Design a protein around this ligand. Structure first.
Ligand code: OW8
Length: 165
């Protein structure tokens, strides 16, 4: 069904995450974590305090697809176990901010060809696939995008619902 999913997404905020590579999304899927540049870390922390759910929707650059979506379960925090992210030519690990804990809602991919009817008002009504890392996606667009993903029957949203407060 889709009823618990719709409940989790009700009044949520949504952010597009553009990963440079598949490895970092693989790490995020395995460890339930994400880290971003301080400019986006501050925005995500503000949103986490401000909304019942904050959803990250992931896309690996040049893949032509989204790789899934997840809900923040914490603000960013430092001092945890290190994560060996793959970072660009000349960027150090301390350039990233703290670590956000995330609960995956869907680990399956969605090709951009299937979201071509969805535009994001907060990015000039461009197709939702278009945007910089951290671009916020307006509520209706983000909800419809998340509902397009194939169902992930490995997921149980019961425990996610209990975290909402
Ligand atoms: C896991 N997080 C990342 O891979 C990331 N987030 N922001 C930026 C990067 C690399 C380049 C800038």
């Amino acid at each position: 069904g889709t009823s618990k999913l719709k409940y989790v997404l009700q009044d949520a905020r949504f952010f597009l995450i553009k990963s440079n590579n598949h490895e970092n999304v693989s790490l995020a899927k395995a460890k339930g974590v994400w880290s971003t540049l301080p400019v986006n870390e501050k925005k995500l922390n503000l949103a986490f305090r401000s909304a019942r759910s904050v959803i990250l929707i992931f896309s690996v650059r040049e893949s032509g697809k989204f790789q899934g979506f997840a809900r923040l379960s914490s603000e960013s925090h430092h001092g945890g176990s290190p994560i060996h992210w793959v970072l660009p030519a000349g960027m150090s690990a301390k350039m990233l901010g703290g670590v956000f804990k995330i609960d995956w809602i869907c680990r399956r991919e969605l090709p951009f060809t299937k979201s071509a009817h969805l535009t994001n008002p907060w990015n000039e009504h461009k197709p939702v696939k278009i945007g910089r890392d951290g671009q916020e996606i307006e509520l209706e667009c983000g909800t419809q995008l998340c509902l397009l993903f194939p169902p992930d029957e490995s997921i149980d949203l019961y425990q996610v619902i209990h975290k909402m407060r």
